[PDB]
Amino acid sequence: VTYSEPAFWCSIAYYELNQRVGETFHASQPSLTVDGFTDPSNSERFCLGLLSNVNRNATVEMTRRHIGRGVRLYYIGGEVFAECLSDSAIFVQSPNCNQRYGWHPATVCKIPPGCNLKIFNNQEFAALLAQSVNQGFEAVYQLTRMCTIRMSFVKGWGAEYRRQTVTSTPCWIELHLNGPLQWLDKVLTQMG
């Protein structure tokens, strides 16, 4: 096996209800904004307003109008932060963040407009990955959800809300951190 540093440090997939909408966006620069506008050629902007969905309903159509400037993600050092540029709060579900404060993996954090949050920490993940080789294949295999982070732009889901699944929110995305995933692969292949 041969390994190479990934070109893109993360990839974001946009979802509407239970259906994938648009292509997967690969972020090359350390900073990018996911807004609801219509620029198609900005390597720093994942404009969702231009994505079309033949199965888009009314309630989603209204939710897509309040995304506005959306969320801005920067990758400073070995940590990932989400800033709420929208005038409406966003709802994030990050296991790495939940565990950092000891919350259930399904916990959903609300980010009011103007606020920010330390979404991810490589050092924290590496530590969990180290003390996981002692729990078996299953535990290490289940560390993939630690590398995936879900956000909702207007409507929250889970406990404290009526929507119990992320597939119930009108507009939500799912991030994949290529960096952490590569570390997980190095340990998984040798775990047998």
Binding site: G77, G78, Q123, A126, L129, A130, K186, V187, Q190
Partner: peptide, 18 residues
Amino acid sequence: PAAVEAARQIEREAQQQQ
């Protein structure tokens, strides 16, 4: 086993970033 050394190397690499 051999895997833990790979993960131990990752921990040193992750500490380097700061």
